[PDB]
Amino acid sequence: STGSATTTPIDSLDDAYITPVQIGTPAQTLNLDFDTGSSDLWVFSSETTASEVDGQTIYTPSKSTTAKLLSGATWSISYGDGSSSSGDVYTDTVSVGGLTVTGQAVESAKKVSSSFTEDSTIDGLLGLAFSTLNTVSPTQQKTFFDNAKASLDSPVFTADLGYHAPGTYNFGFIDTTAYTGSITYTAVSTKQGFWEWTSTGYAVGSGTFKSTSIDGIADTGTTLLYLPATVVSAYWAQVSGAKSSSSVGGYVFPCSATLPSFTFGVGSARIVIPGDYIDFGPISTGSSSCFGGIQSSAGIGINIFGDVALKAAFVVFNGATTPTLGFASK
């Protein structure tokens, strides 16, 4: 089997991407944030504290003939940005782009933090990291991908995120029309539960490539590119007037700037992030200070190849017995 679903930016900055997902019988369609940096599929629901729901579409398990309470199971998650959610668990039928999993754990939120409430466009998350990170207790649950894997034509999914435009998540096949040139594959460590890999270096603009190992994670659920302070300083030094602002919470730059590209290495291959992808617009409405899309990972504890990086590539998440990651230009 295979599946193919379009993923759409939630706003004009590509802050996140939403993908429609069918849950239950008859189908209830919710728009979920596919997150290769976590491993819980959780939704706003009929159980979510009323004051914490503001425009989201909710899953109502009592209206699904295939929903079953997973008795005694609870979940609770905290994300890198400080947001969180928690609740109880149902199993139900879940379909993405025509690919169906029966008996998927659907984690129903009883509580969500303010960031979730305030984002009316995101009805929940669908985790695509390794199932070892799943938070369900006392019986850990599998991701949608893990459950689908054996049925897939090939044990893979691909992320093809757009810049200010829709893109695609495919399951079970590689669309050879969706990228240019060849796909370069690179080793993955699953030791921390992430799609963790080592980039071979970077370049700023038309500058020379610096060969240096940068361990980090491929994370569709993180907006920006978070890299070591040395690398980030070298980038922003090429932008007149750019500076790190503790008050704003990172590097800012004059909105009048033209940003240089940023290249990262994948083995001997190179992925080029155009300068425009690194512009996250005014820090506050009407400001002439703009927020940068490359930020320091210092104090996160891990480097993160988030959407800024991934949307410059066609990315293969290969879940074969020994997982790997593939990157192609597009």
Curated annotation (Swiss-Prot):
Q: Which residues form the active site?
A: 35, 199
Please list the residue ranges annotated as the Peptidase A1 domain.
Answer: 17-328
Primary enzyme class:
hydrolase
* Molecular function (Gene Ontology), one example: aspartic-type endopeptidase activity
Query: According to the UniProt record, which cysteines are disulfide-bonded?
Result: 255-290
Q: Fragment boundaries within the full protein? A: 90 to 419 of 419
What the record says about family reads:
Belongs to the peptidase A1 family.
Which reaction does this chain catalyze?
Answer: Hydrolysis of proteins with specificity similar to that of pepsin A, prefers hydrophobic residues at P1 and P1', but does not cleave 14-Ala-|-Leu-15 in the B chain of insulin or Z-Glu-Tyr. Clots milk
Q: Which UniProt keywords apply?
A: Aspartyl protease, Disulfide bond, Hydrolase, Protease, Signal, Zymogen
Key word Hydrolase present: yes
Tree of life domain: Eukaryota
Record lineage: Eukaryota, Fungi, Dikarya, Ascomycota, Pezizomycotina
Q: What is its EC number?
A: 3.4.23.22
Q: What is this protein called?
A: Endothiapepsin
| One example of a Gene Ontology biological process annotation | proteolysis
